[PDB]
Structures are given as C-alpha cells and as structure tokens.
PDB file of all heavy atoms in Angstrom:
ATOM      1  N   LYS O 128      -8.803   0.957  38.212  1.00  0.00           N
ATOM      2  CA  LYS O 128     -10.139   0.626  37.730  1.00  0.00           C
ATOM      3  C   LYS O 128     -10.912   1.873  37.374  1.00  0.00           C
ATOM      4  O   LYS O 128     -10.626   2.970  37.849  1.00  0.00           O
ATOM      5  CB  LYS O 128     -10.912  -0.203  38.769  1.00  0.00           C
ATOM      6  CG  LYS O 128     -10.112  -1.324  39.436  1.00  0.00           C
ATOM      7  CD  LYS O 128     -11.006  -2.440  39.908  1.00  0.00           C
ATOM      8  CE  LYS O 128     -11.435  -3.354  38.752  1.00  0.00           C
ATOM      9  NZ  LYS O 128     -12.077  -4.567  39.207  1.00  0.00           N
ATOM     10  N   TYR O 129     -11.921   1.706  36.540  1.00  0.00           N
ATOM     11  CA  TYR O 129     -12.724   2.826  36.060  1.00  0.00           C
ATOM     12  C   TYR O 129     -14.170   2.378  35.811  1.00  0.00           C
ATOM     13  O   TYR O 129     -14.451   1.184  35.719  1.00  0.00           O
ATOM     14  CB  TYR O 129     -12.129   3.439  34.781  1.00  0.00           C
ATOM     15  CG  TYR O 129     -12.317   2.591  33.526  1.00  0.00           C
ATOM     16  CD1 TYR O 129     -13.323   2.892  32.605  1.00  0.00           C
ATOM     17  CD2 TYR O 129     -11.470   1.519  33.258  1.00  0.00           C
ATOM     18  CE1 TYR O 129     -13.478   2.124  31.465  1.00  0.00           C
ATOM     19  CE2 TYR O 129     -11.631   0.759  32.109  1.00  0.00           C
ATOM     20  CZ  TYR O 129     -12.646   1.075  31.220  1.00  0.00           C
ATOM     21  OH  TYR O 129     -12.804   0.313  30.096  1.00  0.00           O
ATOM     22  N   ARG O 130     -15.038   3.381  35.708  1.00  0.00           N
ATOM     23  CA  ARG O 130     -16.443   3.149  35.323  1.00  0.00           C
ATOM     24  C   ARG O 130     -16.979   4.423  34.700  1.00  0.00           C
ATOM     25  O   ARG O 130     -16.868   5.506  35.279  1.00  0.00           O
ATOM     26  CB  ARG O 130     -17.305   2.741  36.514  1.00  0.00           C
ATOM     27  CG  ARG O 130     -18.633   2.113  36.135  1.00  0.00           C
ATOM     28  CD  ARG O 130     -19.667   2.230  37.247  1.00  0.00           C
ATOM     29  NE  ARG O 130     -19.640   1.051  38.114  1.00  0.00           N
ATOM     30  CZ  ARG O 130     -19.607   1.077  39.426  1.00  0.00           C
ATOM     31  NH1 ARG O 130     -19.586   2.225  40.092  1.00  0.00           N
ATOM     32  NH2 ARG O 130     -19.610  -0.057  40.112  1.00  0.00           N
ATOM     33  N   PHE O 131     -17.557   4.294  33.494  1.00  0.00           N
ATOM     34  CA  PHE O 131     -18.132   5.442  32.816  1.00  0.00           C
ATOM     35  C   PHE O 131     -19.539   5.731  33.354  1.00  0.00           C
ATOM     36  O   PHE O 131     -20.248   4.828  33.812  1.00  0.00           O
ATOM     37  CB  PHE O 131     -18.177   5.222  31.313  1.00  0.00           C
ATOM     38  CG  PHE O 131     -16.901   5.558  30.614  1.00  0.00           C
ATOM     39  CD1 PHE O 131     -15.999   4.567  30.235  1.00  0.00           C
ATOM     40  CD2 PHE O 131     -16.596   6.887  30.299  1.00  0.00           C
ATOM     41  CE1 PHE O 131     -14.825   4.887  29.591  1.00  0.00           C
ATOM     42  CE2 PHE O 131     -15.423   7.206  29.649  1.00  0.00           C
ATOM     43  CZ  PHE O 131     -14.534   6.208  29.296  1.00  0.00           C
ATOM     44  N   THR O 132     -19.942   6.988  33.242  1.00  0.00           N
ATOM     45  CA  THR O 132     -21.258   7.433  33.673  1.00  0.00           C
ATOM     46  C   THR O 132     -22.049   8.130  32.567  1.00  0.00           C
ATOM     47  O   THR O 132     -23.248   7.908  32.450  1.00  0.00           O
ATOM     48  CB  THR O 132     -21.111   8.393  34.874  1.00  0.00           C
ATOM     49  OG1 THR O 132     -20.214   7.818  35.833  1.00  0.00           O
ATOM     50  CG2 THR O 132     -22.444   8.619  35.559  1.00  0.00           C
ATOM     51  N   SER O 133     -21.405   8.952  31.736  1.00  0.00           N
ATOM     52  CA  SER O 133     -22.038   9.637  30.649  1.00  0.00           C
ATOM     53  C   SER O 133     -21.102   9.702  29.461  1.00  0.00           C
ATOM     54  O   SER O 133     -19.911  10.009  29.628  1.00  0.00           O
ATOM     55  CB  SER O 133     -22.501  11.039  31.067  1.00  0.00           C
ATOM     56  OG  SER O 133     -23.089  11.740  29.966  1.00  0.00           O
ATOM     57  N   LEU O 134     -21.637   9.453  28.264  1.00  0.00           N
ATOM     58  CA  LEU O 134     -20.907   9.496  27.005  1.00  0.00           C
ATOM     59  C   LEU O 134     -21.769  10.069  25.893  1.00  0.00           C
ATOM     60  O   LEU O 134     -22.812   9.489  25.552  1.00  0.00           O
ATOM     61  CB  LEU O 134     -20.412   8.084  26.607  1.00  0.00           C
ATOM     62  CG  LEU O 134     -19.207   7.514  27.314  1.00  0.00           C
ATOM     63  CD1 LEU O 134     -19.016   6.053  26.921  1.00  0.00           C
ATOM     64  CD2 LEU O 134     -17.976   8.321  27.007  1.00  0.00           C
ATOM     65  N   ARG O 135     -21.309  11.173  25.317  1.00  0.00           N
ATOM     66  CA  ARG O 135     -21.996  11.796  24.184  1.00  0.00           C
ATOM     67  C   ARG O 135     -20.986  12.163  23.095  1.00  0.00           C
ATOM     68  O   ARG O 135     -19.836  12.518  23.388  1.00  0.00           O
ATOM     69  CB  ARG O 135     -22.776  13.065  24.595  1.00  0.00           C
ATOM     70  CG  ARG O 135     -24.010  12.792  25.428  1.00  0.00           C
ATOM     71  CD  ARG O 135     -24.919  14.008  25.467  1.00  0.00           C
ATOM     72  NE  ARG O 135     -24.224  15.191  25.971  1.00  0.00           N
ATOM     73  CZ  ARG O 135     -24.068  15.482  27.254  1.00  0.00           C
ATOM     74  NH1 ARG O 135     -24.563  14.705  28.229  1.00  0.00           N
ATOM     75  NH2 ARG O 135     -23.408  16.584  27.596  1.00  0.00           N
ATOM     76  N   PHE O 136     -21.439  12.068  21.852  1.00  0.00           N
ATOM     77  CA  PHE O 136     -20.638  12.409  20.677  1.00  0.00           C
ATOM     78  C   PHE O 136     -21.391  13.447  19.849  1.00  0.00           C
ATOM     79  O   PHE O 136     -22.599  13.361  19.668  1.00  0.00           O
ATOM     80  CB  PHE O 136     -20.343  11.183  19.807  1.00  0.00           C
ATOM     81  CG  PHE O 136     -19.655  10.071  20.542  1.00  0.00           C
ATOM     82  CD1 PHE O 136     -20.377   9.043  21.135  1.00  0.00           C
ATOM     83  CD2 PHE O 136     -18.269  10.042  20.626  1.00  0.00           C
ATOM     84  CE1 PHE O 136     -19.725   8.017  21.796  1.00  0.00           C
ATOM     85  CE2 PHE O 136     -17.624   9.018  21.307  1.00  0.00           C
ATOM     86  CZ  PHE O 136     -18.348   8.004  21.881  1.00  0.00           C
ATOM     87  N   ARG O 137     -20.650  14.442  19.350  1.00  0.00           N
ATOM     88  CA  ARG O 137     -21.221  15.562  18.647  1.00  0.00           C
ATOM     89  C   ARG O 137     -20.486  15.795  17.333  1.00  0.00           C
ATOM     90  O   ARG O 137     -19.251  15.691  17.279  1.00  0.00           O
ATOM     91  CB  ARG O 137     -21.153  16.848  19.504  1.00  0.00           C
ATOM     92  CG  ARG O 137     -21.904  18.039  18.931  1.00  0.00           C
ATOM     93  CD  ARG O 137     -21.689  19.294  19.769  1.00  0.00           C
ATOM     94  NE  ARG O 137     -22.261  19.161  21.091  1.00  0.00           N
ATOM     95  CZ  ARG O 137     -23.515  19.456  21.400  1.00  0.00           C
ATOM     96  NH1 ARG O 137     -24.360  19.922  20.476  1.00  0.00           N
ATOM     97  NH2 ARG O 137     -23.937  19.318  22.649  1.00  0.00           N
ATOM     98  N   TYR O 138     -21.244  16.093  16.270  1.00  0.00           N
ATOM     99  CA  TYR O 138     -20.704  16.385  14.955  1.00  0.00           C
ATOM    100  C   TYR O 138     -20.899  17.862  14.618  1.00  0.00           C
ATOM    101  O   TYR O 138     -21.961  18.434  14.893  1.00  0.00           O
ATOM    102  CB  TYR O 138     -21.370  15.511  13.875  1.00  0.00           C
ATOM    103  CG  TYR O 138     -21.014  15.858  12.444  1.00  0.00           C
ATOM    104  CD1 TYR O 138     -19.785  15.471  11.920  1.00  0.00           C
ATOM    105  CD2 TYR O 138     -21.899  16.566  11.636  1.00  0.00           C
ATOM    106  CE1 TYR O 138     -19.433  15.778  10.619  1.00  0.00           C
ATOM    107  CE2 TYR O 138     -21.550  16.879  10.339  1.00  0.00           C
ATOM    108  CZ  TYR O 138     -20.337  16.483   9.830  1.00  0.00           C
ATOM    109  OH  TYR O 138     -19.997  16.790   8.542  1.00  0.00           O
ATOM    110  N   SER O 139     -19.873  18.472  14.031  1.00  0.00           N
ATOM    111  CA  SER O 139     -19.906  19.887  13.664  1.00  0.00           C
ATOM    112  C   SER O 139     -19.522  20.057  12.202  1.00  0.00           C
ATOM    113  O   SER O 139     -18.440  19.564  11.792  1.00  0.00           O
ATOM    114  CB  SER O 139     -19.005  20.699  14.588  1.00  0.00           C
ATOM    115  OG  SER O 139     -19.038  22.074  14.238  1.00  0.00           O
ATOM    116  N   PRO O 140     -20.327  20.738  11.390  1.00  0.00           N
ATOM    117  CA  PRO O 140     -20.047  20.814   9.962  1.00  0.00           C
ATOM    118  C   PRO O 140     -19.170  22.000   9.576  1.00  0.00           C
ATOM    119  O   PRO O 140     -18.971  22.942  10.337  1.00  0.00           O
ATOM    120  CB  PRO O 140     -21.465  20.986   9.359  1.00  0.00           C
ATOM    121  CG  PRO O 140     -22.156  21.780  10.409  1.00  0.00           C
ATOM    122  CD  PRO O 140     -21.666  21.247  11.719  1.00  0.00           C
ATOM    123  N   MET O 141     -18.614  21.904   8.346  1.00  0.00           N
ATOM    124  CA  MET O 141     -17.782  22.955   7.774  1.00  0.00           C
ATOM    125  C   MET O 141     -18.072  23.163   6.279  1.00  0.00           C
ATOM    126  O   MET O 141     -17.177  23.631   5.559  1.00  0.00           O
ATOM    127  CB  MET O 141     -16.284  22.632   7.931  1.00  0.00           C
ATOM    128  CG  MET O 141     -15.743  22.644   9.359  1.00  0.00           C
ATOM    129  SD  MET O 141     -13.951  22.540   9.390  1.00  0.00           S
ATOM    130  CE  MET O 141     -13.674  20.880   8.787  1.00  0.00           C
ATOM    131  N   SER O 142     -19.256  22.828   5.786  1.00  0.00           N
ATOM    132  CA  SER O 142     -19.520  22.804   4.369  1.00  0.00           C
ATOM    133  C   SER O 142     -20.842  23.488   4.076  1.00  0.00           C
ATOM    134  O   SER O 142     -21.741  23.495   4.923  1.00  0.00           O
ATOM    135  CB  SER O 142     -19.548  21.374   3.836  1.00  0.00           C
ATOM    136  OG  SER O 142     -20.430  20.564   4.589  1.00  0.00           O
ATOM    137  N   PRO O 143     -21.012  24.089   2.893  1.00  0.00           N
ATOM    138  CA  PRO O 143     -22.276  24.701   2.517  1.00  0.00           C
ATOM    139  C   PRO O 143     -23.304  23.657   2.041  1.00  0.00           C
ATOM    140  O   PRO O 143     -23.065  22.459   2.063  1.00  0.00           O
ATOM    141  CB  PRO O 143     -21.890  25.654   1.378  1.00  0.00           C
ATOM    142  CG  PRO O 143     -20.697  25.017   0.763  1.00  0.00           C
ATOM    143  CD  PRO O 143     -19.936  24.427   1.933  1.00  0.00           C
ATOM    144  N   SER O 144     -24.469  24.169   1.606  1.00  0.00           N
ATOM    145  CA  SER O 144     -25.576  23.302   1.194  1.00  0.00           C
ATOM    146  C   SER O 144     -25.402  22.731  -0.209  1.00  0.00           C
ATOM    147  O   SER O 144     -26.247  21.903  -0.603  1.00  0.00           O
ATOM    148  CB  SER O 144     -26.878  24.100   1.253  1.00  0.00           C
ATOM    149  OG  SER O 144     -27.180  24.520   2.560  1.00  0.00           O
ATOM    150  N   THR O 145     -24.381  23.127  -0.936  1.00  0.00           N
ATOM    151  CA  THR O 145     -24.131  22.560  -2.258  1.00  0.00           C
ATOM    152  C   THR O 145     -23.613  21.129  -2.139  1.00  0.00           C
ATOM    153  O   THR O 145     -23.818  20.310  -3.033  1.00  0.00           O
ATOM    154  CB  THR O 145     -23.132  23.426  -3.011  1.00  0.00           C
ATOM    155  OG1 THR O 145     -23.515  24.810  -2.866  1.00  0.00           O
ATOM    156  CG2 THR O 145     -23.144  23.120  -4.512  1.00  0.00           C
ATOM    157  N   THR O 146     -22.963  20.807  -1.029  1.00  0.00           N
ATOM    158  CA  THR O 146     -22.466  19.455  -0.784  1.00  0.00           C
ATOM    159  C   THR O 146     -23.620  18.480  -0.552  1.00  0.00           C
ATOM    160  O   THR O 146     -24.508  18.732   0.286  1.00  0.00           O
ATOM    161  CB  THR O 146     -21.526  19.463   0.421  1.00  0.00           C
ATOM    162  OG1 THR O 146     -20.452  20.388   0.179  1.00  0.00           O
ATOM    163  CG2 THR O 146     -20.940  18.078   0.662  1.00  0.00           C
ATOM    164  N   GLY O 147     -23.615  17.379  -1.268  1.00  0.00           N
ATOM    165  CA  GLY O 147     -24.636  16.347  -1.138  1.00  0.00           C
ATOM    166  C   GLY O 147     -24.039  15.026  -0.700  1.00  0.00           C
ATOM    167  O   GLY O 147     -22.952  14.672  -1.115  1.00  0.00           O
ATOM    168  N   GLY O 148     -24.772  14.302   0.143  1.00  0.00           N
ATOM    169  CA  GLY O 148     -24.332  13.028   0.636  1.00  0.00           C
ATOM    170  C   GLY O 148     -24.822  12.807   2.059  1.00  0.00           C
ATOM    171  O   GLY O 148     -25.719  13.498   2.538  1.00  0.00           O
ATOM    172  N   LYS O 149     -24.217  11.803   2.710  1.00  0.00           N
ATOM    173  CA  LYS O 149     -24.564  11.463   4.078  1.00  0.00           C
ATOM    174  C   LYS O 149     -23.312  11.079   4.847  1.00  0.00           C
ATOM    175  O   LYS O 149     -22.335  10.578   4.291  1.00  0.00           O
ATOM    176  CB  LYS O 149     -25.571  10.294   4.151  1.00  0.00           C
ATOM    177  CG  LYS O 149     -26.989  10.664   3.737  1.00  0.00           C
ATOM    178  CD  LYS O 149     -27.915   9.442   3.751  1.00  0.00           C
ATOM    179  CE  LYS O 149     -28.251   9.016   5.159  1.00  0.00           C
ATOM    180  NZ  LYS O 149     -29.130  10.021   5.838  1.00  0.00           N
ATOM    181  N   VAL O 150     -23.370  11.330   6.166  1.00  0.00           N
ATOM    182  CA  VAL O 150     -22.355  10.884   7.125  1.00  0.00           C
ATOM    183  C   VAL O 150     -23.083  10.085   8.197  1.00  0.00           C
ATOM    184  O   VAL O 150     -24.246  10.311   8.503  1.00  0.00           O
ATOM    185  CB  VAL O 150     -21.548  12.051   7.731  1.00  0.00           C
ATOM    186  CG1 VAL O 150     -20.697  12.718   6.672  1.00  0.00           C
ATOM    187  CG2 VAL O 150     -22.470  13.071   8.385  1.00  0.00           C
ATOM    188  N   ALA O 151     -22.356   9.122   8.770  1.00  0.00           N
ATOM    189  CA  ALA O 151     -22.943   8.144   9.686  1.00  0.00           C
ATOM    190  C   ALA O 151     -22.024   7.860  10.864  1.00  0.00           C
ATOM    191  O   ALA O 151     -20.806   7.769  10.700  1.00  0.00           O
ATOM    192  CB  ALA O 151     -23.279   6.836   8.954  1.00  0.00           C
ATOM    193  N   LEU O 152     -22.641   7.708  12.021  1.00  0.00           N
ATOM    194  CA  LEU O 152     -21.949   7.357  13.263  1.00  0.00           C
ATOM    195  C   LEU O 152     -22.652   6.158  13.930  1.00  0.00           C
ATOM    196  O   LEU O 152     -23.873   6.084  13.943  1.00  0.00           O
ATOM    197  CB  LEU O 152     -21.918   8.532  14.268  1.00  0.00           C
ATOM    198  CG  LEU O 152     -20.771   9.551  14.173  1.00  0.00           C
ATOM    199  CD1 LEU O 152     -20.924  10.493  13.012  1.00  0.00           C
ATOM    200  CD2 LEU O 152     -20.678  10.318  15.484  1.00  0.00           C
ATOM    201  N   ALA O 153     -21.844   5.255  14.487  1.00  0.00           N
ATOM    202  CA  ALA O 153     -22.374   4.072  15.152  1.00  0.00           C
ATOM    203  C   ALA O 153     -21.422   3.670  16.274  1.00  0.00           C
ATOM    204  O   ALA O 153     -20.241   4.032  16.277  1.00  0.00           O
ATOM    205  CB  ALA O 153     -22.578   2.921  14.191  1.00  0.00           C
ATOM    206  N   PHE O 154     -21.953   2.885  17.210  1.00  0.00           N
ATOM    207  CA  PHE O 154     -21.197   2.406  18.358  1.00  0.00           C
ATOM    208  C   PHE O 154     -21.458   0.926  18.569  1.00  0.00           C
ATOM    209  O   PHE O 154     -22.595   0.473  18.478  1.00  0.00           O
ATOM    210  CB  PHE O 154     -21.599   3.175  19.618  1.00  0.00           C
ATOM    211  CG  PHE O 154     -20.715   2.903  20.810  1.00  0.00           C
ATOM    212  CD1 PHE O 154     -19.455   3.504  20.927  1.00  0.00           C
ATOM    213  CD2 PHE O 154     -21.131   2.062  21.819  1.00  0.00           C
ATOM    214  CE1 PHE O 154     -18.646   3.257  22.023  1.00  0.00           C
ATOM    215  CE2 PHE O 154     -20.320   1.809  22.924  1.00  0.00           C
ATOM    216  CZ  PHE O 154     -19.087   2.399  23.019  1.00  0.00           C
TER     217      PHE O 154
END
C-alpha cells in the first residue's frame, strides 16, 4: 500500500525568444 504526500511538476525550456506558441499542463 502507498499514500502520496507532495507532488510537483516543473517545466524547463530549451528555446530562444524567436519561438512563438504555448505549452500546457493539466492533471
């Protein structure tokens, strides 16, 4: 058996400012 206590997700970029658009995260 298990039980979670803390959950976090982090995004890290690799692109310059010339790139246009959006990225999205959901749970």
Side-chain angles (χ1 to χ4, degrees):
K128 315 207 79 169
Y129 73 100
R130 196 202 268 132
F131 276 100
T132 313
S133 178
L134 283 172
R135 288 197 304 276
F136 303 93
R137 188 185 294 273
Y138 173 77
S139 181
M141 294 190 291
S142 52
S144 298
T145 315
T146 303
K149 286 177 74 69
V150 293
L152 272 76
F154 189 79

